[PDB]
Design a protein around this nucleic acid. Structure first.
Ligand SMILES: [Zn+2]
Lengths: 180, 112, 138, 46, 49, 88, 49, 85
RNA sequence: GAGGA
DNA sequence: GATCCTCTCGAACGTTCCATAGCTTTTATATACGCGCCTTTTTTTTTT
DNA sequence: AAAAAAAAAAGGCGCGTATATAAAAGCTATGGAACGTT
């Protein structure tokens, strides 16, 4: 065991607590994107940290695309200021971790069919559909996306250890349903 | 009790009446037969008794009994007119209950 | 979900795609539903079977099928990209056997018959030719 | 050899545990015979 | 020596007994008994083949 | 797409296996008695079976002159069915 | 018969074709699958048995 | 808990009698048991009247994939006092 | 189905 | 009705329109592995 | 003979498959209403 499921992404929503002018942000801001016919969301991205700001008409701004919690936070604080840089009285309010997407590798194929027959209470392999396996640990509430290549993808989390602590309790089962 | 759409009541009433009817007699003339999930109609009570192996003629006026046997017969001119040659294996099976008296107690002891 | 449950329990091999060709399920909500249903039934309480079905669908004889059987049996122990959704591995084992033989069922017919990739077969065949060492019974 | 089953069609030999129930491995048949015993059965010449 | 002529259902050989029936499309005339009011009848049970 | 073959398949099979000529839902209203089990007791019994003949339900039990040469004047299962069952 | 597996088979040991035959029995393959033997019968009242 | 009171000694582990074995009475010929879900006996003794030799035992799978078995018993019948001719 | 008588 | 025995089988309807929750909206990502489809690659082709 | 053009596809990523979160903004459908309609 002892494999850290590296967070492949971290999501975070921050509310500006205001109401911008969506056309105004499109014309004035530089790293901004917003299309009415598709979805009324401002597509704002900053090069450092490289995340995306899912800014809606109601000031709900989502920070996605970082790999760590604070990068998804640091980008947000930059995100709010650049909105303030437009000329609005935006405010960095209501920051929260939304989701932590993460994957790992075990370097050995796993008997997911073995995982499914004994741990079918917990396993789900769809070789015809999904080359991984969905192993949802209740405590912590983490889903282990368990691939035949060994890719154990973990997400549905806002706690960094929750991804980590769940794996430490699941590797022996993969060694149970391993080949070599 | 739960509201009376006044003429679904008859639609269910006649149903109940029909059910009881065919239950006591599945052979009402000018009727459907209450079938049972198989095509075979239901064996109402009345048909449980109808003649020729109803209860009466089949289980009361005549039944099937123990202590009996059945076989092919064969003539024999060395049997007294009233005798009958029951084959040994049969006699090994049919029995007759004697009562132990001083007259037979020894013999019965030998038998047992 | 329950149909695949019944087939697996009675040892019947059935493709999600076959089941979906029976029923419009969108296959993704189907995946989630089968997952949850399997978990429910596990609370309430082996991939070789697919070979002969496709052997029949392609019209293949029984010795060919048993050659494929032994190939698939060794497939589990021949990681080195063994299975990763082993339906592809089964179909490539079939392709190995037909190429070992002289059967005019060239990849086009088998692919269009089994709704499989014309390229994943050769992707498997790449490692299959190296793997050829551990596949000769007689 | 000692025997456990016979393929019906191929008329060869075979052995099996509680495994498969079919497949004269050569012909892959589905009917097998129970490979007559060796109890040296006794018989009465009459 | 087996001569065929039968079906195998569930592995049990079944055989269809020929059924006899009256001929269709044939006109027939019958007297009727005294109690009836009709003294004669001509009947024809026409049917498509 | 979505044609219930099992309808025809099972319908034919069931009808043969029981001989109730009718529908699988028809229990008694279906005519029965066809499709017996091919008496194979003795070769000749088999042959005779395959050429048998039935009549449901006018003196039909009689032996009419027109049977000459078409139906065996002799063979018939005396009993209730005497005269009804015939053989070619 | 020894290959069929059906209920209730009865096979004679030493069948014999009849001595008195009819032409037609040829077509019934009877004299190849006979169904009895030729006993030396004697018609007599021997011992009333 | 449902032993047939006959004689199970004949058959082998697969609940079958090898052909050529002599049987009689109501010796079981098929040992089939059912789970209670320990497990009760649902064997198949042969007819209490008769006896003979197991002739040939055929094992196969049903149409649907159920393993299923046919057994044939051989017996010689000599004419007796009552037989019909 | 079977069916003997 | 229609003998006798074995033995085999399966005010209701419209009508309007608020009120529930969803869904679906993009967008981060691990894998395989599907078509998708660009483009240049690569030929085949036509004319000079 | 030689130039130039006409056109198939190969291979690569299309995105797309599923898998899993996490976010409410056009649309859907469910859920609620009782009063217009005979
Ligand atoms: Zn064989």
């Amino acid at each position: 065991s002892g494999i850290v499921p590296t967070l492949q992404n971290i999501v975070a929503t921050v509310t500006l607590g205001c109401r911008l002018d969506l056309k105004t942000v499109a014309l004035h801001a530089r790293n901004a994107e917003y299309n009415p016919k598709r979805f009324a969301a401002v597509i704002m991205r900053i090069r450092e940290p490289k995340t995306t700001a899912l800014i809606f008409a109601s000031g709900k701004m989502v920070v996605t695309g970082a790999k760590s919690e604070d990068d998804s936070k640091l980008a947000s604080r930059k995100y709010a200021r650049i909105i303030q840089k437009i000329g609005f009285a935006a405010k960095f309010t209501d920051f929260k971790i939304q989701n932590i997407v993460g994957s790992c590798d075990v370097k050995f194929p796993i008997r997911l069919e073995g995982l499914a027959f004994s741990h079918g209470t917990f396993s789900s392999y769809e070789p015809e559909l999904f080359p991984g396996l969905i192993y949802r640990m209740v405590k912590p509430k983490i889903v282990l996306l368990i691939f035949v290549s060994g890719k154990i993808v973990l997400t549905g989390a806002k706690q960094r250890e929750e991804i980590y602590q769940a794996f430490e309790a699941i590797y022996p089962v993969l060694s149970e349903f391993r080949k070599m | 009790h739960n509201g009376a759409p006044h003429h679904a009541i008859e639609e269910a009433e006649s149903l109940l009446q029909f059910h009881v009817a065919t239950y006591m007699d599945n052979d009402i003339a000018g009727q459907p037969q209450a079938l049972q999930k198989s095509g075979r109609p239901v064996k109402s009570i009345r048909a449980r008794l109808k003649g020729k192996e109803g209860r009466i003629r089949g289980n009361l006026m005549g039944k099937r009994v123990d202590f009996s046997a059945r076989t092919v017969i064969s003539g024999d001119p060395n049997l007294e007119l009233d005798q009958v040659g029951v084959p040994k294996s049969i006699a090994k099976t049919l029995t007759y209950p004697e009562v132990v008296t001083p007259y037979n107690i020894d013999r019965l002891t030998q038998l047992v | 979900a329950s149909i695949l449950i019944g087939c697996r329990r009675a040892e019947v091999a059935r493709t999600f795609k076959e089941i979906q060709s029976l029923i419009h399920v969108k296959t993704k909500e189907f995946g989630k539903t089968l997952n949850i249903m399997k978990n429910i039934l596990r609370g309430k309480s082996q991939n070789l079977t697919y070979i002969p079905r496709f052997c029949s669908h392609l019209g293949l004889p029984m010795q060919v099928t048993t050659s494929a059987e032994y190939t698939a049996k060794k497939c589990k122990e021949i990681k080195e990209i063994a299975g990763k959704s082993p339906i592809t591995i089964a179909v490539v084992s079939i392709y190995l056997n037909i190429l070992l033989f002289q059967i005019p069922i060239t990849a086009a017919k088998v692919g269009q018959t089994l709704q499989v990739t014309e390229g994943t077969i050769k992707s498997g065949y790449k490692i299959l030719y190296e793997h050829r060492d551990k596949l000769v019974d007689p | 050899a000692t025997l456990k089953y016979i393929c019906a069609e191929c008329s060869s030999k075979l052995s099996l545990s509680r495994t498969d129930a079919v497949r004269c491995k050569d012909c892959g048949h589905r009917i097998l015979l129970k490979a007559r015993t060796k109890r040296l059965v006794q018989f009465e010449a009459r | 020596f087996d001569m065929g002529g039968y079906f195998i259902i569930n592995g049990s050989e079944k055989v269809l007994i020929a059924q006899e029936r009256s001929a269709g499309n044939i006109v027939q005339v019958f007297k009727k008994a005294a109690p009836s009011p009709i003294s004669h009848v001509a009947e024809i049970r026409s049917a498509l083949e | 797409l979505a044609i219930n073959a099992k309808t025809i398949t099972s319908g034919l099979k069931y009808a043969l296996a029981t001989g109730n000529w009718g529908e699988q839902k028809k229990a008694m209203s279906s005519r029965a008695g066809v499709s017996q089990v091919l008496n194979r007791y003795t070769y000749s019994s088999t042959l005779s079976h395959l050429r048998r003949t039935n009549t449901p339900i006018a003196k039909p039990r009689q032996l009419h002159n027109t049977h000459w040469g078409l139906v065996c004047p002799a063979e018939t299962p005396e009993g209730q069915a005497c005269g009804l069952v015939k053989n070619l | 018969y020894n290959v069929r597996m059906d209920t209730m088979a009865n096979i004679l040991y030493y069948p014999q074709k009849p001595l008195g035959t009819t032409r037609a029995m040829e077509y019934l393959k009877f004299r190849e699958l006979p169904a009895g033997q030729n006993a030396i019968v004697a018609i007599a009242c021997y011992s009333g048995y | 808990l449902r032993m047939k009171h006959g004689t199970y000694d004949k058959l082998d582990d697969d609940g079958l009698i090898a052909p050529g074995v002599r049987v009689s009475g109501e010796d079981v010929i098929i040992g089939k048991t059912t789970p209670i879900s320990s497990k009760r006996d649902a064997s198949t003794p042969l007819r209490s009247t008769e006896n003979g030799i197991v002739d040939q035992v055929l094992v196969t799978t049903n149409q649907d994939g159920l393993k299923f078995v046919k057994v044939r018993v051989r017996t010689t019948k000599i004419p007796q006092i009552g037989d019909k001719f």
